[PDB]
């Protein structure tokens, strides 16, 4: 395989004065961009949700809920606070096969409507990155959608690497 290079981290803003308590709760994935994200026209990606629960020790318990093969499935993982507020690493990284590196950075949010989060991982020696556009509801304005496209492009991703998952009612509500 070939891949679009991960951008340098200096091109990825960090949300100023991140407020971990305010960010918890359910977020819908209304946009998704990445070097392994690809528009499939015939089978469009379904919207999923991700729930952030802040723990006693200030890490997040993060649960994603998906509608796959007629059932809800739940992927749980831990985000451990990193170097600056709003950055995380993945907890228990040794329990993920082939995984050597994993970084999360909250790029911006207003907490009660929208967020943009950056992810970078190295698995089987390949460097993957993605940007997620989170919304407290399933719809978001054209202005936010365009802004996200603009941001995705600034990290080297073309239009065919950007997807807006289709809203669904099953599992995620």
Instruction: Extract the tokens encoding 143.
Output: 């202005």
Binds Cl ion (CB under 5 A): choice among 15, 50, 109, 152: 50
Query: Which of 172, 148, 173, 147 minimizes the C-alpha distance to 162?
Result: 148
Out of 24, 59, 61, 64, the residue judged to bind ligand 4OL by CB under 6 A: 64
Tell me the window of 46-54, 69-77, 102-110, 164-172 that interacts with Cl ion (CB under 5 A).
46-54
Q: Say if CB 45 and CB 164 are below 8 A apart.
A: no
Alpha carbon separation from 133 to 47, 70, 168, 173 (Å, rounded): 11, 25, 17, 18
Handedness of CA 50, 118, 42, 150 (dihedral sign): positive
**Is 130 one of the binding residues for ligand 4OL (CB under 6 A)?**
yes
52 is annotated as contributing to ligand binding: no
Closest CA to 172 of 54, 60, 50, 69: 50
Phi then psi for 110, rounded to 5 degrees? -115, 10
Stretch binding ligand 4OL (CB under 6 A), from 19-27, 118-126, 141-149, 164-172: 118-126
- At closest approach, how far in Å is the CB of 64 from Cl ion? 6
CA distance 17 to 48: 27
Candidates 70, 88, 87, 71; CA nearest to 79 is: 88
Among 52, 67, 111, 119, binds ligand 4OL (CB under 6 A): 119
Q: Binding to ligand 4OL by residue 128, rule CB under 6 A?
A: yes
Query: Is 74 marked as binding a ligand?
Result: no
Q: Is 121 in the site for ligand 4OL (CB under 6 A)?
A: yes
Minimum CB distance to Cl ion, residue 157 (Å): 17
- Taking CB under 6 A as the rule, does residue 36 contact ligand 4OL? yes
Q: Which is nearer to Cl ion, 41 or 157 (CB)?
A: 157
Residues found near Cl ion in the complex (CB under 5 A)? 50
Task: Name the residues that contact ligand 4OL, by CB under 6 A.
Answer: 34, 36-37, 48, 50, 64, 75, 96, 99, 119-121, 123, 128-130
């Amino acid at each position: 395989s070939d891949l679009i290079p991960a951008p340098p981290l200096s091109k990825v803003p960090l949300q100023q004065n991140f407020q971990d308590n305010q960010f918890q709760g359910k977020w819908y994935v209304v946009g998704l961009a990445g070097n392994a994200i690809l528009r499939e026209d015939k089978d469009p990606q379904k919207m999923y949700a991700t729930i952030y629960e802040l723990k006693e020790d200030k890490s997040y318990n993060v649960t994603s809920v998906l509608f796959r093969k007629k059932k809800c499935d739940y992927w749980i993982r831990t985000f451990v606070p990193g170097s600056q507020p709003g950055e995380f690493t993945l907890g228990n990284i040794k329990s993920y096969p082939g995984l050597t590196s994993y970084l999360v950075r909250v790029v911006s949010t207003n907490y009660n409507q929208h967020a943009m989060v950056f992810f970078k991982k190295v698995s089987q020696n390949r460097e993957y990155f993605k940007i997620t556009l989170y919304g407290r509801t399933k719809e978001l304005t054209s202005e936010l959608k365009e802004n996200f496209i603009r941001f995705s492009k600034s990290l080297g991703l073309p239009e065919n690497h950007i997807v807006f998952p289709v809203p669904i009612d099953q599992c995620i509500d």
